[PDB]
Curated annotation (Swiss-Prot):
Residues 244-458 are annotated as: AAA-ATPase protomer 3. Transmembrane segments: none annotated. Belongs to the midasin family. It comes from Schizosaccharomyces pombe (strain 972 / ATCC 24843). The chain holds residues 451 to 1541 of 4717 of the full protein. ATP binds at residues 24-31, 273-280. It is found in: Nucleus; Nucleus, Nucleolus; Nucleus, Nucleoplasm. This is Midasin. Associates with pre-60S ribosomes in the nucleoplasm. Signal peptide: none annotated. The gene is mdn1. It comes from the Eukaryota. Disulfide bonds: none annotated.
Length: 737
């Protein structure tokens, strides 16, 4: 009756030659539209999904023009996510024609949406009958499926028409390795793929299991024998269409692997979550069973269309990292999700056989993906467990207590990738040494001494340069992380320690400044060429005409022809891309690809090696926008900062020339608390002061310090400051055209 009402409303609209929309939540006002279109006659459903091709491609260059000359139905869908394409409202305001149909379709504009006479949109056994068809057993199953869509109220979040696609897939794998009860369980499986608690899975198997016939019956659901009797089969509840690795599989891994496998016989599919957990690791572990090869198209941040071979052949592609899509290959890729496997690029289609068509967003606000895209594909999401897991990928109590300390840290407040770093790093053979190892690795990122002391207690529950104490506990950490060759950020002494290490480990520290592709790659014109070609013709048999005569009868081609980059030149070293927070994104994307235990040269591309190509970067604290918390966590960071400042100046000063700094130290202290009040020694100032003090070509030491602190601190600071200069001079005298 609701469909009767909407159809009558659309009839009343269509008789009047007006505009009409329908905002709702189902994506089936278009189904009602095409339904009533054909049920009246069906002119042509020109269903222009007007959310991707922004404003011209609808209008001109046009589909609406071809309609208004033709006589189709202009089903402008998704006008509630568009741009200012108000030329379409102008074309509405034009109304030559005979009978058009501009029956647009919103989905919940101050003048477009105020010019279209809208009509909002407002029994599962019936649609369950029309979907299922193929006993009174199945009538009890109709009651079961209705109980499932009724227990939808057990909380988007398992929304409405997910049951429709589930019934379609149950019809799909129905005779193809399925009991009807088993097929219902499979449909339920992909009703609770992305969920929170398996009590819904308990009740779903409970209703489906009851319809089937219990623990012996649930084991009889695991009888894959007549299922696989029918296409290279898989293990259990699994017989797909038609070798191994060192990819060893635990319990939960085998569970999610069987999940993705249960997806991978139907034909789109998306798989979101944490990147370090190996989504394509599982995808290629299943591709090891020769569905295809795992062509991981790793779109970083501005991957363009130059990045169909998997459409022609097999070699199952994965447009990975599509969260950070470059905003139009997402749109043309969704245009490739209109047809099944037809790709028009000028040249028409592919129509593939089955390999896969998987995809991988991330754990979801760095450019959140489309919910229309997140509702156009059969999506997916993914202590002593860790105690066992580390026992092989690393070399009884050292390992167990580290996992317990990870648990302890969670209770207190932290990436376990760094726990693997802690494991494989610790060459200890000693519980105290391993304690210090997990300590310092945890004491890497200490942005404050509070949490540092807290984690210390939690673990307790288990040359041209100048040496310095408070930077030795940065230089030692960078030396150790260099030996491990881990990625090393730094968040006061930064470039000093970097050049210190490049002094010690004799190397070529190619440095860089913030604000970029040529840090990674360059595409310049290919400078000095002129007399080189003249001598190359002078060293050839038998002038441009002379060169042409020689061609008629390498250097000649080189003349007619008239890649390099920073980490690449470092690949040819250590790349110290300082101020990394204000770096690029796509460069940071490929650097994330450069990061995890492997390098890559995403040029037609290749993969670079690494001989010690350290990204020994830096980024000072505080447009100081940090990176992704992965991209922070993918690098082993380090944080950094008395009378020894005076001792340091004593090293920094001239030969005798001593006690002026002992005045100048406290003079800087009183200047610090007085002017711009904070207890920081401000060692740029004291350094330049020691520079001029050791540059004192005059005598009378106190006058040298007088003119010095006049030059650096004092005169830098109303007219009362003049008075305060005297006060400053007081602290000086207290230290005394």
């Amino acid at each position: 009756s609701s469909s009767l009402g909407l159809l009558e409303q659309l009839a009343a609209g269509v008789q009047t030659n007006e505009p009409l929309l329908l905002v709702g939540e189902t994506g089936t006002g278009k189904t009602t539209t095409i339904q009533l279109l054909a049920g009246l006659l069906g002119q042509k459903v020109t269903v222009i999904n007007m959310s991707q091709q922004t404003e011209s491609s609808d209008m001109l260059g046009g589909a609406l023009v071809k309609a208004v000359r033709s006589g189709h139905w202009v089903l402008l869908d998704e006008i509630n996510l568009a741009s200012l394409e108000t030329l379409e409202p102008i074309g509405q305001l034009l109304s030559p024609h005979k009978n058009f149909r501009l029956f647009g379709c919103m989905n919940p504009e101050p003048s477009f949406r105020s010019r279209f006479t809208e009509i909002y949109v407002h029994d599962l056994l019936s649609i369950i009958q029309k979907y299922i068809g193929s006993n009174e057993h199945v009538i009890r199953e109709v009651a079961e499926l209705y109980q499932v869509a009724k227990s939808l109220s057990l909380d988007p979040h398992y929304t409405v028409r997910t049951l429709s696609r589930t019934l379609s897939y149950v019809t799909e794998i129905a005779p193809i390795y399925g009991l009807r009860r088993s097929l219902y369980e499979g449909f339920c499986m992909s009703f609770l793929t992305l969920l929170d608690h398996t009590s819904e899975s308990l009740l779903y198997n409970h209703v489906v299991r009851f319809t089937l016939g219990n623990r012996d019956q649930q084991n009889a659901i695991l009888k894959q024998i007549p299922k696989v009797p029918d296409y290279i089969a898989f293990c259990h509840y699994w017989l797909r269409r038609g070798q191994e690795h060192y990819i060893i599989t635990p319990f939960v891994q085998k569970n999610l692997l069987n999940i993705a496998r249960a997806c991978s016989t139907r034909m789109p599919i998306l798989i979101q979550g944490p990147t370090s957990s190996g989504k394509t690791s599982m995808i290629e572990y299943v591709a090891k069973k020769t569905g295809h090869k795992f062509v991981r198209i790793n779109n970083h941040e501005h991957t363009d269309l130059q990045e169909v071979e998997a459409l022609r052949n097999g070699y199952w592609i994965v447009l990975d990292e599509l969260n950070l899509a470059p905003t139009d290959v997402l749109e043309a890729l969704n245009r490739l999700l209109d047809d099944n496997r037809e790709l028009f690029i000028p040249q028409v289609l592919v129509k593939p056989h089955p390999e896969f068509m998987l995809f991988a967003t991330q754990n979801p606000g760095r450019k959140h993906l489309s919910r229309a895209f997140r509702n156009r594909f059969l999506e997916i999401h993914f202590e002593n467990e860790l105690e066992t897991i580390l026992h092989k990928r690393c070399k009884p109590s050292y390992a167990a207590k580290i996992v317990q300390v990870f648990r302890e840290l969670s209770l207190r407040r932290a990436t376990l990738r760094d726990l693997f770093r802690w494991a494989f790093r610790e060459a200890v053979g000693y519980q105290q040494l391993a304690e210090n190892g997990y300590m310092l690795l945890a004491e890497r990122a200490r942005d404050q001494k509070d949490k540092l002391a807290v984690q210390e207690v939690i673990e307790k529950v288990m040359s041209k340069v100048v040496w310095t104490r408070p930077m030795i506990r940065l230089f030692c950490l960078v030396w150790r992380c260099l030996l491990a060759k881990e990625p090393v950020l730094l968040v006061c002494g930064k470039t000093t320690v970097c050049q210190i290490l490049a002094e010690c480990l004799h190397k070529e520290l190619h440095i860089i400044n913030a604000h970029g592709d040529i840090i990674g790659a360059q595409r310049p014109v290919r400078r000095s060429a002129v007399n080189y070609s003249l001598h190359s013709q002078l060293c050839e048999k038998f002038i441009d005409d002379l060169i042409e005569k020689f061609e008629k009868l390498n250097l000649i081609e080189r003349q007619i022809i008239k890649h390099d980059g920073a980490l690449v030149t470092a690949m040819k070293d250590f790349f110290l891309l300082d101020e990394i927070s204000l770096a690029d994104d796509s460069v940071l994307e490929r650097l994330n690809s450069v990061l995890e235990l492997s390098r890559t040269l995403t040029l037609a591309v290749s993969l670079t090696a690494k001989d010690g190509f350290a990204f020994f970067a830096t980024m000072n604290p505080g447009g100081k926008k940090e990176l992704s918390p992965a991209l922070r966590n993918r690098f082993t960071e380090i944080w950094v900062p008395t009378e020894d400042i005076l001792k340091i100046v004593e090293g920094k000063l001239h030969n005798n020339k001593i006690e002026l700094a002992r005045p100048l130290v406290e003079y800087a202290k009183w200047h610090a608390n007085e002017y711009l009040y904070t207890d920081v020694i401000s060692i740029r100032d004291v350094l330049s002061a020691v520079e001029f003090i050791n540059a004192c070509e005059i005598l009378d030491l106190n006058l040298v310090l007088f003119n010095a602190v006049s030059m650096v601190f004092i005169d830098a600071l109303l007219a009362s400051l003049h008075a305060e200069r005297q006060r400053c001079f007081a602290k000086l005298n207290e230290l005394a055209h």
